[PDB]
């Protein structure tokens with residue numbers, strides 16, 4: 001219970017402030033531990049409400065304790081800002097926003113489960129912010145009760161957990177910071193049970209036994225952890241787990257810390273009415289009043305709370321080990337400032353200078369009961385913010401010279417953010433956390449308030465600007481198509497970063513900058529833009545049907561009439577020729593003579609074959625060709641249109657699963673026709689050529705080609721490794737690595753391997769990589785398209801079922817008409 005003056009006074013001694021948060025999965029006792037801190041040291045003031053965003057704690061340390069702080073200190077009082085944090089992590093930018101206003105973190109890990117992925121993810125982001133961690137291994141009660149673990153197994157579990165945490169810390173912490181790893185013997189690891197209400201540090205026991213052993217606690221805390229053994233028989237401390245005779249010695253941690261706790265649990269839970277009193281009296285635990293009548297769990301909870309109040313263990317680590325803003329801003333200043341390292345504002349941040357020009361970072365907007373009004377939440381890194389102070393509001397795009405995102409207004413009121421309540425205060429100096437009212441409209445989400453025209457913007461969130469997240473959108477009710485199509489246009493007009501287009505497989509595609517952006521776009525589409533039910537799904541990928549070699553034997557097919565026959569063979573068109581056709585070097589309408597010369601002289605074709613191409617397909621211009629190689633066919637000219645038409649048909653619909661053919665060359669070897677045109681009409685020859693083409697194709701070692709993206713990723717050096725890791729899991733192929741900006745990695749990524757790519761990429765790069773993708777080329781899959789179990793076969797089988805086709809692919813024999 002403090003007055004505003006008392007708060008303001010506490011806020012003046014920034015050396016004695018601790019800005020931090022709790023990094024913990026909700027299921028690991030996050031709430032219970034924070035509640036414990038609040039109940040023990042929460043600060044309350046001596047008709048609006050907001051969403052609780054931060055809580056203020058007050059803690060006092062003894063004169064001797066304060067001397068242990070390896071940091072500038074002034075007095076024995078401390079103000080601790082416990083900043084609320086989401087948790088939902090896969091490396092979200094929101095989390096990074098809350099972390100940004102903190103300098104230290106209390107990391108909660110589970111005794112049994114250890115370090116979960118979420119916690120690892122948030123810790124990594126925290127380390128990326130140069131935040132110093134302190135750890136609490138929670139839920140010890142579970143190991144004692146459920147698993148009935150032994151003292152040594154518990155110790156080993158603790159040791160493994162501490163190691164897992166330090167692996168992460170040693171991997172992501174900046175070298176300039178020195179050793180940021182956590183050490184039980186140094187008092188930076190606590191152990192306890194949030195729900196139960198107890199916890200301890202080695203320092204607390206070292207303090208509790210230093211005088212009893214007649215040694216200074218510095219020596220005691222080193223002896224109460226790790227390989228230190230006190231042999232009662234020799235009265236000596238050693239680092240050997242066996243005595244002279246080779247007999248096993250019990251670890252000091254187990255002997256002096258775990259044993260007392262184990263015996264309390266055992267004695268109390270087993271209702272040992274006579275032992276309990278002795279044990280309590282020996283540990284100087286005094287029960288008062290009705291507590292003396294308690295038994296079992298109820299008694300245990302009461303005994304442990306008096307024995308090792310959890311909050312006390314946590315506050316100790318926060319005060320003695322987490323940095324103050326003064327300490328932290330010295331090495332965080334540069335990261336936080338996008339401007340010159342030797343700039344006046346940067347220097348003011350480095351020195352946490354309250355007299356300098358204002359540098360206040362708005363971390364987020366907090367919802368209030370003030371009719372739709374939100375209060376800005378953030379931290380004063382330099383200067384002092386004041387009520388009715390002219391300030392410069394700079395958005396995520398504001399740049400010194402250009403007036404983009406600039407907003408010069410007078411701060412209506414500065415308020416302390418005490419849980420769900422606010423308390424107006426005249427001003428707030430550098431180093432503190434604070435809330436601002438009246439900043440609503442001028443800013444939304446992150447921002448920066450400065451009182452310097454030269455003031456640059458504090459580190460802004462980098463955001464994707466490419467429509468890399470894409471999905472297929474279809475109406476649930478056919479009749480609504482007109483509304484969807486219209487909606488897409490409306491959506492596009494209202495949003496510059498959204499992309500909509502028709503896919504090669506006839507699907508309406510909606511693409512956004514990121515998952516969240518795409519999600520907003522799809523919601524507004526279904527609800528407003530189109531205002532009709534929609535079905536969202538992973539876009540269907542288009543494939544191409546090709547041949548790996550020449551037909552193993554002449555393909556023969558006859559017309560329904562049975563009077564006409566076509567003999568042909570299919571073979572591959574070289575990639576460079578297909579590309580030449582697709583890109584306009586070799587064209588359907590070019591003079592057949594000049595075109596033949598190019599194909600022969602430049603692409604190695606036989607000039608006669610080239611001069612005799614009957615057509616390109618599909619659509620008369622695709623990268624597939626029919627070459628006449630017949631010799632003495634009397635009515636050849638009369639079946640040409642029919643042969644061409646059939647090819648347009650076959651190349652549009654391949655025999656593997658109906659996809660378009662690509663790079664297929666068909667050579668008409670011979671044709672036998674009935675003398676009378678009456679039996680040689682299109683209705684007879686078209687079916688014949690189509691049937692023979694499919695046969696030739698199937699006989700030519702059929703293959704399917706998949707679409708491949710050219711992916712370009714910008715990112716910091718130490719994150720490049722993530723790119724390669726993900727690419728290797730998705731048949732990616734690095735193309736290049738170029739660069740004093742960032743790194744740009746280019747690679748090939750199969751389109752059917754890109755769904756969700758964006759998500760796994762940020763996961764492997766700690767949300768530091770930005771992907772861009774554009775269709776690049778077709779790639780032939782080597783596996784057998786006709787084998788349902790191969791890679792290509794799996795794709796083919798799935799598409800066939802999706803189209804209601806018979807699962808098995810009709811073989812070449814199905815189209816072959818023996819003589």
Ligand SMILES: CO[C@H]1[C@@H](O)[C@H](O)[C@H](OC[C@@]23C[C@@H]4[C@H](C)CC[C@H]4[C@@]4(C=O)C[C@@H]2CC(C(C)C)[C@@]34C(=O)O)O[C@@H]1C
Pocket residue numbers: 467470499501502503504505509511539540541542543707708751773774775
């Ligand atoms: C500028 O934005 C670009 C990029 O996002 C990318 O190049 C994208 O690629 C779309 C596809 C383009 C391919 C060519 C037209 C032929 C094969 C087509 C694809 C089919 O599998 C591969 C990619 C991904 C697609 C399906 C899955 C949608 C394509 C399609 O549009 O169907 O196109 C948009 C317009």
